[PDB]
Symmetry: D3
Subunit: 318 residues, 6 copies
C-alpha cells in the first residue's frame, strides 16, 4: 500500500514539540492517588484449556472508579518464580480474550496476563458518558482529562502490574509489558507511570502525536477524532479536545520511561502512521531501539517477532 | 443498491413470529416505574439563532438512571397553544444537535424538540458498561435487558413526551413523534410505551426483526451484533444476546401502538433492509400506511417528505 | 477524508493569472444583448404544497435562444414587499425541483425562486449539440464560447434576476443569489453580470480555475474535461477547449463582483478542490469573507448554514 | 465477476411479452417519412492515415432534424464493387472516431463506415432538450417518443445505409451492419427499419427489455433511467417514460428483422445483463444464432471475433 | 461479509456426484510408485531460534521428480518418543516458513514439520511448465494429470510423512496432519494416500468440488481457473482441464480417508465456499465432525482452535 | 490522476546504472548457451477467416531446450516482406493474440507473436529453485542464471534469428514491437541482437526496479514487494535486486543502436512514468518519447497513428 508519510531520513529526525500542559505531572499524580484508594481485591479461578504444561486462570481485580477489570492469566506449570508479562490488546481487536496467545506466551516460559481493555475485549467501565461523542471509544469523555476514556485504561494497566507483581510465583524483578498499536501505547504508558516493569516492547504504538495523526492517518481509529469535530463544530470544542488528549499522548509520556524499550514500525502503516510512531520513539530517553520494516503496515511482522522473543529472553527469561 | 431482499409480493406478507418473552410486558412496566422515580426537573435556556418568527432554547431534563438528557427546542414566535413534535435523530447521525432542522420544523408551525440520544448527538449516559462489546452502541450491555443501551434511550423518549406535554404553550392533544431509522424506531417505541403522542411518522425504522436483520443487512450498524458474536464465540452468549434484543425489537412493540402511523421504505435500503421494516409495519394494528419507494435506499426521500408534511398537517396543524 | 491539496498557508496566497482573452468583456456584452432580444413573458401557476404561511408557484420565462426556463417560486403568505432569493442547484443534483428547500427559504421570510438548470433539474435547452463530447454537460459545445453549455445557463441566471425583480411583492433592493458548487458558481457569475443582486453566498463554487482543476480534482464532474480530451486527442482541441472555458471561469468573472460576498470551503473537498475555490475568492475585489472548514468536504456544512442565515438576515431580512 | 442473472436453462426460455403500443408501427412509418424529407447531400473528404492498400475519408450527410452526421469511411484501395459494413460504436465509447478499427475492417476487404452517434463520438444533434433529465443521453427527451434521443440516432443509422448503398464502389447486395452493446442495438434497429442490410452481427445488444433492465443491471448506463426516476418522483413520469422507451426497445423491433443474425453474450455481463440480450434474441424470427460465453462480460470476446469474421466472410466477402 | 451460499439445511445434504475417472485409483498407484523410486535422503541442520525447551532444524528431502523439498522441523527438547504433526500452509500464504507457528506447536508437545509447498513458501519444483496458463499455480500443467502442479505437491506431502515417521524421536503411531485451506486439502489428500497419519484436522479445505467452485467462489484463488478459460477459449480445453482436476479433487479422495477427521467452515467464507467444504465432508466415510461457524469467513477461527487442540490432545498427546 | 514526478523532472530523470561488473559477460555467456540449441523451427498452416493472409503456428527450440510457440501471419502475396516480432503483455495474452497478429499481416508485415513462457503459451523447462511470490516476477530471482526473464529474453533473440531465416522475409526490414512487458522484450531483444532494424515500445516494463517497487501502485511490479514480505532475510532483498539488475532496461538501453519510438501516459500506475523516462533517458540512439497526459496503462489511439507511421517509414516503404 506504498509509501505515503515522511521519507525515512525525515522520520528519523521527526520530534514534535511536547504538548504537555503545565499541570501534566500533577494530573497523573492525582490520578494514581485516586487509583491507590481502590483496594485491588484480586480473584483467581482456574480455567480449563487443552494444553499441557500450563495452568490457566481467569483473573479479576478492582481499579479506578471501582471497575472490575478482567483477563486470562496463564502460568508455566512448574516451580517458579517465573518471569512475567502483561500483554495489552489492540483497539476493538480482542477475540475471546486472546486466550490462545496468552497460553502460548506461558509456553515460552512467562507468567502472562492479558488485560482486557474496558468495554472492548472485556472488563467493566464504570466511567459515565458525559455527553455526545463519535462512534467508538476514542472520543468518550474527551472534553475533560478527568472523564476521558483512556484515563481509566491507563490506570488499569498500572494496577495490572501491581497485582501481577504481588503473586508468589512471579519474580517482581523480571516483568515486561508488551502489546501492539493500542497495546503498544498501554505498554509504554504503564512503563511511564510505574517502575514495576523491567522492559517494554511496543509494536507500532497508537495514541501518539494526536495533532499530526488526525491530519495524516488514512484509516480508523484516529479518524474518530475527525468524526467528532464534524459533529461538534464549536471551535472551542476542538481546542479543548486536543487539550485533553495531550495528557495521554505518548510524546508527553515517553520522557518518563526508564526501562529498555524495543519498538517496531512498518513504513506503509496507514493506521498508526510512521511519523506518529517515530515521534514517540524520538521522545524516549532510555536504552531503546526502533525496528523499521519497509514492506509492512499495521500487521503481524514475522521478522519483528524474532527480535521480540530475543529481547524478552535476554532481559527476562535469561 | 439494486434489489436484493424479498420480492415486494413477499414483503407485503412477511410477518415473523413475535420473539417477546413471557415477562415482556412486566419488564416495561417495571422500567417505566423506575423512570417515574426520577423527577424531570426540566430547564430551558434561550439560544440565539439567525431566524425570524421562532424562539430557540436548549432543553434538559432528568431521566432513567438520573441521566441529564438534552436537545434543542424551537417554538413558533406567536401565541399558542401550538401542536408539537419530538424528533429523534439517526444512529451516530447528529451534527450540532440538528438545530437547523429543528428550527425549520418550528417554522412549519410545530413546537419542536430534538432529543439527543445518549452519548451520540448529546445527552449524558450514566448506565455503566457491564463488559466487553463490539465497537459502537448496539451491543453495550447486551447480556441483560436491564443493562442494554436502548433501555435508557427508550425511557428518555417517553420522558421527552412527558416534559413537552407539560409546557403551557403546547397543546397536549396535538403531539407527534417522528424520526428516521434509529429515530423512526424511537418514535414507534415511544408511541408504544406512552399514549401521549397522537400520531407517528417513521422513515425506514431501525431495531426491527433483529434475528433476520443480522443475516440480511449489508451495512452498519446491524452488523455490530455480528461483530460482537465474532469476538465472543460462546454459544450461550448469542442466545442471551437475542433474548435481550427481543425486549426492544419493534416487532414485539408494534402491537402496542394505537396512534395513526405513517412509514416509508426504499426497496434498495441496505442498512434497514425492506424485510425488517415490513416486519414492523405488518405487526402494527392501527390506522397505518407504508409508502414504498422502489428507487431509494437509506436516505432522504423527497416524495415521502410531502406525504409526511401532509400527514402531520392533517392530524396536528389543521385539527381539533 | 484527509488533506490533499495545497497547505492552508499556500491556499491563502493562491491567485492564478487570469486567463481571460482580450475579447472577454465584449463577448459577455454581446451575449447579454442577445438575451435582451428575448421577451421574458413570465408565467405563474399556483402549486399546492402542505405548508401554512407560504404560497408556492411554478414559474417559467423565456431566455437565451428562446428557451423556456422553469422553477418553483415560494412566497411568504403576508403583505410585502419581501426580500428575495434566487437559489441555484448543484450539478445533476436537483430532485423534484428542490421544492422542499425552496419552501423552507420562504418560511425564513424570502420570496424564493429555485432556477432549474437547463436539461438538469428542469428547463428547456434549445442550444444544439455541435458535435461529440464526453458523457455529461461539462463539454457540450465546448469548441466555441458561442455554443458552450454554460453560456445559456449564465444568461438564464441573469434573466431570473430580471424576472424576480419585476414582481410587485419583491423589494428589488433586497435580492440575494445563493447556491452550492454549480449553484455557487451561478450565483457569482450572475452577480458579476448583473447589478440587481445585493449580496452573494456561494458554497465551494464550481467552474473555477479550470486548468488547475483538471489536474487536481479526484472526482466528477471536472474530470469530464479529461474524459473529453481522451476521446479527442487532437492537441488543437485541448487548446481550443481551454480557450472556451476561460470565458466562463470564475477567476476571470470574480473581478466584476461588487456585492458583499460570503463563501465556504471544506479542506478535504475532492470535487471542488480547495485551491480552485481559493483562486476564485482571491480574485474578488469586494466586501468578502471565506469560511474554511478543515473537517468537511463537498457536502452540507452545518456551521456554515448558521453563517449563511446570519449574513442573509443582516443584508436582506432585517 | 460471477454469475448473477437467470440460469442458462431459464435464459433460453426467457421471452418477455412485447410492450409495443398500438401505434408502434405508425410511429416508425411517420419517423421514416420525416427522415425522407431531408436530402442526404453527402460529402467525402480524403483523410490521411499511415496504411497501405486503403483510402480513408471523412463522410458527412444530413439526417433527421437536418443534423449533420459524420464518421470515417475506409475503402479497400482496389477495383470494386466492394462488400460494405456500417459499424456502430458503444455508448460514450468512441475515441477519435474509432478510426483504427475502421481501417482494419477495410483491410479485411470491406468498405466501412463508422457512424458517430449524435453528441457522443461525433455528429451534430439538433434535437432540443425538452426538459430536465439524468446525467447522460439515456433520458434526454424521454417524456415523448417524438423527442427521445434515440429517435434521431435510429434514423441516422437508416440514413447511413442509404448513403453507403448509393456509392458506386459499394455492392448494395452485400452490406452488413455490426456493433457492440449500443452498437449492437443500432445494428438490429437499422436492420429492422431497413431492408438494405444483408446481415447483422450484434455483440451483447443494449436498449433491450428496459423494464427488466432497470431492475437487474448493476452498472451504467441502464441505471441512468433509475437516476431519472429518483430526480422526478411523479408516478405518471415513470409510466410515461416506459411508454416512450417501448418504441425503441429491441424486443419490439426484433420481430421486423429478416436478415441472418449473429449475436453474442457473456454470462457475467453486468452492463447488458444476459436476460435482456436473450430477450431480444428470443424475439427474433429469422436465421439466427446466439453465441454464449460463460467466462466473459461486457468486453471484447476473442472467440466471438472468429465467429464474426467467419459469418461476415460467408455472407459478404466470399 | 454476509451469507451467500446454500442455506445451512441444504449444505448439510449437499453431496455432489463424484467426478473420478475410471483410472482414478490406477493414476495414484502409478504416481506413488514413481515417488517410491526416489530415495528420500533426508538432511537435518540445527537452526537457532529464541526459544527455551525446543530444538529447531531445517529439514530437506528428495521427492517426486527429484525435487528437494524443505521446511522447518521443531522438536520438544526432552526425551521422546514424541507425537508428531505435519503442518501444511495456505496458498501463497507462507512467511519465513511459518517458523513461529511451527515452534509453538512443538511447545505444545508435538515434533512438528511445516512442509513448504513447491515454489510457494519454499522447496524446489522440478516439474516443467508444459504451456501457457493463468497467473498463479492453480493452472500450471493443467492439461494433463501427469503434469499438474498438485501431483508433485500431494506426493511431497506423502513423502513428508514417510520421512517424519522414520525419525527415532517420533512415535510413528501418533502422527497427525493439519492445515487450513490449501493446507487442509493437503492434510486430507495425504491421509487419503497414506495410512501413516492417525488423525486429520482441516480448516475449510481448498481444492474441493472444482466444478461448483468456479461458479460460486467470489475471490481468488479458485478463480484462477476462470482466468485460464478466458485466455484459452477452446471448448476442449475446458473439458480437459476439469478432467485433470478431478484426479485431485477432495470429493474423489475423501472416500479413502479412514482416520478420525475434524473440519471447520465459516458460513461467510468467500474463498473456500461453504458448499465446496460440505461437499468434501459429506464424502468422508470415517469418524468425522464438521464445526460450523456462522460469523466467520476464510480466517483464523478462535473457537475452532480450542476444538483443534482438544482433538489433537485426545488422539495424540494423551494417548497410546 | 497525476502522481509521479512532474513532467519537467521526468525529462531529467536518469538514475545511475545498477549493472554489475560482469553484466556484459553474463549476456555473452547466456547467448552462447542459446546458440548451443538448434532452432529446428516448424510451421503448420492454421485456418483463419481472412482473405489475403496465410496464418501458421510456429514453434522453435530455445534456451534450456524449451519449445517456444506463437502465431505467424504472412501477407498472401510474393515477398520479400518486411517483418515484425510482436511481444505481448504480462499475463495478457488471449488465444495467442491471433486477431492482432493477422491485422498486422494485413498491414503488410510478416508477423510473429511470440508467446512468453508459461503465460500466453510456450514451454518453460527452467526449474523453480525455491519459494517465490504468486506470479512470474520472482521465479528464480535469487540468481541471474535461474531468473524467469533470462529464458524469455533469449527466446526473444531466437525469435529474431528464426524469422530472419525465412525466405519470404527481408532480413533488413525487421521490427520489434510490444507494450509494457512486450515493450521491454522489444528493447531487450534490440539490445542483445542487431537483427531488428527498429523498435517500438509502449510504456516498457522491467525498468528501474529499485524505484519501481517504491512508486508503482498496481501489479505486477508489486510482486517483488510481496516476495520480500514472505522472505524477510535482508540478504535476500540485496540478492534479489542484484539479479534484477541484469535484466533492467536502464542497464540494457545503452546497447540499443536502432531507431526507437516509445510512449508513456502520465497517469500510468502499472509502469510509472518515472521508470519509463528512466529507460528512455538511458537510450543513446535515434529516439523519441511520446507523452500522453490523459492516458494510463492502456491502448492510446493517438500513439497507434505514430506507431504505424514510424513502422511504415522505416520498414514498409
Ligand atoms: Cl465529553
Ligand atoms: Cl496498514
Ligand atoms: Cl454486557
Ligand atoms: Cl442504502
Ligand atoms: Cl463542441
Ligand atoms: Cl468530497
Ligand atoms: Cl423530456
Ligand atoms: Cl461487465
Ligand atoms: Cl498444461
Ligand atoms: Cl472470507
Ligand atoms: Cl530462487
Ligand atoms: Cl494505469
Amino acid at each position: 500500500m506504498q509509501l505515503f508519510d515522511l521519507s525515512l531520513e525525515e522520520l528519523k529526525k521527526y520530534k514534535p514539540k511536547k504538548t504537555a500542559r503545565p499541570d501534566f505531572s500533577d494530573f497523573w499524580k492525582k490520578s494514581l492517588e485516586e487509583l491507590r484508594q481502590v483496594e485491588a481485591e484480586p480473584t483467581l479461578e482456574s480455567y480449563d484449556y487443552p494444553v499441557k504444561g500450563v495452568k490457566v486462570y481467569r483473573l479479576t481485580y478492582q481499579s479506578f472508579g471501582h471497575s472490575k477489570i478482567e483477563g486470562f492469566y496463564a502460568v508455566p506449570d512448574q516451580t517458579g518464580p517465573h518471569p512475567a508479562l502483561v500483554r495489552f490488546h489492540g483497539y476493538n481487536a480482542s477475540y475471546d480474550g486472546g486466550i490462545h496467545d496468552i497460553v502460548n506466551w506461558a509456553l515460552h516460559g512467562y507468567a502472562t496476563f492479558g488485560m482486557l481493555v474496558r468495554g472492548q475485549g472485556g472488563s467493566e467501565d464504570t466511567s459515565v458518558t458525559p455527553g455526545g461523542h463519535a462512534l467508538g471509544w476514542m472520543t468518550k469523555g474527551i472534553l475533560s482529562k478527568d472523564t476521558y476514556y483512556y484515563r481509566g485504561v491507563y490506570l488499569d494497566a498500572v494496577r495490572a502490574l501491581e497485582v501481577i507483581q504481588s503473586f508468589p510465583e512471579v519474580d517482581e524483578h523480571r516483568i515486561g509489558v508488551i502489546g501492539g498499536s493500542q497495546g503498544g501505547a498501554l505498554a509504554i504508558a504503564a512503563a511511564a507511570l510505574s517502575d514495576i516493569p523491567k522492559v517494554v516492547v511496543a509494536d507500532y504504538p497508537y495514541l501518539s502525536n494526536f495533532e499530526r495523526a488526525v491530519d495524516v492517518a488514512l484509516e480508523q481509529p484516529y479518524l474518530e477524532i475527525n468524526s467528532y469535530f464534524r459533529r461538534n463544530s464549536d471551535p472551542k470544542v476542538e481546542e479543548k479536545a486536543f487539550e485533553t488528549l495531550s495528557y495521554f499522548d505518548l510524546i508527553n509520556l515517553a520522557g518518563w520511561v526508564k526501562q529498555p524499550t524495543l519498538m517496531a514500525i512498518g513504513l506503509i502503516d496507514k493506521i498508526t502512521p510512521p511519523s506518529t510512531v517515530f515521534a514517540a520513539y524520538n521522545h524516549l530517553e532510555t536504552d531503546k531501539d526502533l525496528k523499521v520494516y519497509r514492506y509492512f503496515g499495521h500487521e503481524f511482522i514475522p521478522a519483528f517477532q524474532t527480535e521480540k522473543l530475543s529481547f524478552l529472553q535476554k532481559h527476562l527469561l535469561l
